[PDB]
Design a protein around this ligand. Structure first.
Ligand SMILES: [Cl-]
Ligand SMILES: [Cl-]
Ligand SMILES: [Cl-]
Ligand SMILES: [Cl-]
Lengths: 330, 330, 330, 330
């Protein structure tokens, strides 16, 4: 997975992510209303009544809704992404905390926090535990990003030493290694720019670029988390600023096209195809959630505030996996 | 620009391209009917009557329709793409030939040819001339690709030495240098694969990848024509085969996502933004033409055979530059 | 600069480094005998008596010899290397420590320590201070590597948070960033191997490498400290094991050939050439010190033990900057 | 193998090469005197009298001396390097030519040519034949480079279409593909320079290089022939001009250190180590021949003109594989 946030010229914060994985568990757009109640652990029936309604992509396959990303009615945005070989969870909670299953972190935070500081305060009351789930069969190795209405972003990483918080980050996150490593890695690529290099001579030979784009020489094109981070970060820096919410969604999806993974192009060590199942964006000020799918390029949108946020039940929207082609003539 | 063709499992041939440029002159989908007539040179009133109707993207700003790419009623597909520093044209026709403006080549070929052999045979009675056009102010440096209904592809390059023809190619083309150079460059990257490298040790340190995608190590991520050719070619090789026409369009657009250029990421030496204006695909068997735009992710389609192919006038369809977002609620 | 250690199959440990800089202050091979004495600070009179004799490259331009690298009579080896933007020193010593000038660290450690644990204990007794020196005009930003006769290596980095010690490392060190960063970066390159990739097809086209060496695709060739680290580490991994001390020296100099910088190839932002001034190797068991220079490919050697270890003066050997070409005929 | 020529400030031309191979057939420095005579073919009796004496590295294991590279008494320099998958030889000579074994081309040309013009005229008189030899057991795939005393260089490549000649080249040659391919590939890397990139911001984060060297971002560091060509060419361009013959040798060897392959680092698909067996340089004006070996960094020199050029027998000099270490103690 890959993710970033941007700010528009009309003072709106937007966040977007690709979800890259090897299977499509039954996933849909889920609106969780206020006071629905969300479990902390799947093997215990302790429930936190959530203050806030929120909308995002997720699964209803276990006891409480598992949100992969989303935005709440107070403009807080966030996502869980993979963090293989780095994520570390405890067997028992630390003194003064309750255990939480890593897959309920987004649902719990979007249900209960407004600012990135709220999020940091909230997570001190919990210890992530090594609790499995039936969709995957194991606890996935995860890390977490949040962006609030102000545009401030944070990264939360369950490292071997404990929870590592990174404040006021560049608003880009992919997978392993840790955020500091990628932030440092950025420095090796500062020569990657939009501008062409000057012509040179070798002897009596004039040498000029083949066409355009030679300013990017040195940027990698593979789909490793470190390469994905570089592409999302550099193209976030150089893509034109979005003037409004629509341009924000459009631009986010253009930046993420450089990390969109076709089926077959990346295989796991077991030969499973790891691909971009969907791409989503969300806006803190409007509380609109947008998505497109591997099989459908047409962006769909769900407005959180359009619904009865005191509903008794979840409100869900199913994926349309048919390429939604506008016929201009028969 | 970047382009490729694929074959589906149900025996269809499709071809697609991105159009990368610094300005958007009035462009639209054009159907040219049979017996419309296409000029050879913009300054002379000699026309060739076209045997075949065709559809594609182009301009109606000069005397005859200028098609950037398209498919004809007999399944022939093709496109003109940039070829800077290589394209060479003459001031006067070679003896035995007529001159032709480089921008009229796709129109003439789609109007009169069925097979890739037909195209090769057809281009021998013409010399490309350095005639300007009002759309750009100069003759753009171009080379040409064609794929016929059988899936065979050719590249035609106006080199300093004369027209260079490559037959039965890999069905990928971007910009400069010439096709043999890119086909040779492929060999340097055969280690770019979907599969992860094996873990190693250094002393007592075990070293494993950060996540997935490390089989791609070495593939460049910049937008030079050589890097674009590599990415299209390798992702064409490893993306899952399309089962049908709709999977074809979807897969073509996923492979081209890797060479989709966001505005601001590539600047020319004049400071102009070079970005992916549209992405199109077309199918030899159905004669359907499909496109999406920088500002509009939803794919539209025009069927050539749905129209009156003996119509007197061009039939056109205008771009919809609004992001066509499906609203799932209210 | 770049550095590594290796172990031979006859149980010897060797260490080598390049010295890359923009000018050559008066440098030479220095033997410091036992009980000679070394200052901790230029501005204070305290002289620490050294228990052990040592040899290495260094300067005699300040009060006590400054060794850039070397080996002592107990087989402890070490070197100081650049650490730009990371090294940070204090104005005053911490409670219960003595201040030390960064450039006197190698002289103090070689003079008084045998194992890497000894080095770690010795350093707790000191605080590195921001004291300048006359050779450069400022306190240079440095980090340190040591390798004892057992072949265990450590890295000591004066970070913003305090002294960071890395134990039992891979025995490679260049410049910034920190050792943990580079050791993590190794993981992105585990696909760099001696073995060629298998042939592939694209359609009917068979693709095979140009020659040999394609297993290394992905490895960077520039002279940045991260690129230098990767090349030293991967080439350390795959270069044939040395069977004796002479092969050990030979192999070290071959591995470092991949990070040997010709004059003019790397300029600072003032346009000064940063080049490899010398390359040195040393062996814990023999106490031999070997070196070649930019202008002289012939390796020269100095034996520590051959000299009077109780000498009452330094013993120095001057550089021969003339290419030492053996004339095979008149 | 890798090769280049340079011109000194004092107007001397020098040429150098590495020899990279998987085995070391008995090789030495050979002076071939005038009128010694060189076979064209092993299976036919004709010996061609050589007008000129020459010196270089080679083999005496077959009928006539086989020189791998060398310089003649009129200042012509040249070498044969590998050209896998591209070299194409005939079964019979073309009408009007004599057949020649590919391994005898250097001896015949050095024995009889002065200028690159002469070399071209000479090669038009031959057809390279698919004749084997008892050193390898097969006709090795080869291509050839020559530099005359004026400093003009040519490349001669036995392609499938016939001999291809490239005149006044940049004075760099490695292995496959053909010279025009590599010369075009140089254009993709014109952004590889000695100078650092400017610092950038990302949000509030200031990004600066780790150290020095970041102008080189993009240059590959693997040992394939295309990567070796880029490193030799770019470092020939930016390495300071050699002021005299001795600096010329030193600089050539520094440039070639970037393509010096340690044993173990490159294996063939038959698991053989391909490594740099020797590195040689030669000077057209002095007719001095210089070399170092994998196991001995000290350069030896042979002067052609010092010998009796009308001697009846070869004059040879054996390799000294012992690392020739200057012992400084006394
Ligand atoms: Cl281009
Ligand atoms: Cl990943
Ligand atoms: Cl090779
Ligand atoms: Cl550095």
């Amino acid at each position: 997975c890959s993710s970033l946030s941007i700010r528009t010229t009309d003072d709106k914060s937007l966040f977007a992510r690709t979800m890259d994985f090897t299977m499509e568990p039954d996933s849909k757009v889920i609106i969780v209303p206020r006071n629905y109640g969300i479990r902390l652990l799947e093997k215990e029936n302790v429930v936190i009544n959530n203050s806030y309604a929120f909308v995002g992509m997720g699964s209803t396959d276990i006891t409480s809704p598992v949100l992969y990303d989303g935005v709440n009615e107070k403009g807080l945005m966030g996502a869980m992404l993979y963090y293989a070989t780095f994520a570390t969870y405890a067997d028992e909670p630390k003194k003064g905390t309750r255990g939480i299953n890593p897959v309920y972190v987004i649902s719990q935070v979007l249900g209960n926090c407004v600012t990135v500081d709220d999020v940091i305060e909230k997570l001190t009351s919990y210890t992530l535990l090594n609790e499995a789930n039936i969709i995957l069969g194991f606890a996935p190795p995860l890390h977490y990003t949040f962006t609030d209405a102000s545009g401030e972003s944070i990264v939360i990483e369950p490292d071997k030493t404990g929870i590592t918080i990174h404040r006021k980050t560049i608003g880009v996150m992919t997978a392993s290694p840790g955020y500091e490593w990628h932030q440092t890695n950025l420095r090796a690529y500062i020569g990657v720019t939009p501008n062409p290099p000057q012509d040179i001579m070798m002897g009596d030979l004039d040498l000029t670029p083949f066409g355009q784009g030679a300013g990017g020489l040195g940027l990698p094109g593979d789909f490793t988390p470190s390469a994905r981070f570089l592409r999302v970060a550099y193209w976030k820096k150089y893509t034109e600023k979005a003037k409004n919410e629509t341009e924000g969604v459009t631009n986010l999806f253009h930046i993420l096209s450089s990390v969109n993974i076709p089926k077959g192009v990346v295989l796991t060590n077991e030969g499973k195809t790891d691909y971009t199942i969907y791409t989503s964006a969300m806006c803190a000020q409007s509380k609109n959630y947008y998505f497109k799918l591997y099989d459908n390029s047409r962006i769909s949108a769900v407005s959180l505030m359009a619904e009865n946020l005191n509903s008794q039940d979840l409100i869900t929207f199913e994926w349309d996996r048919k390429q939604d082609i506008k016929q201009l003539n028969q």
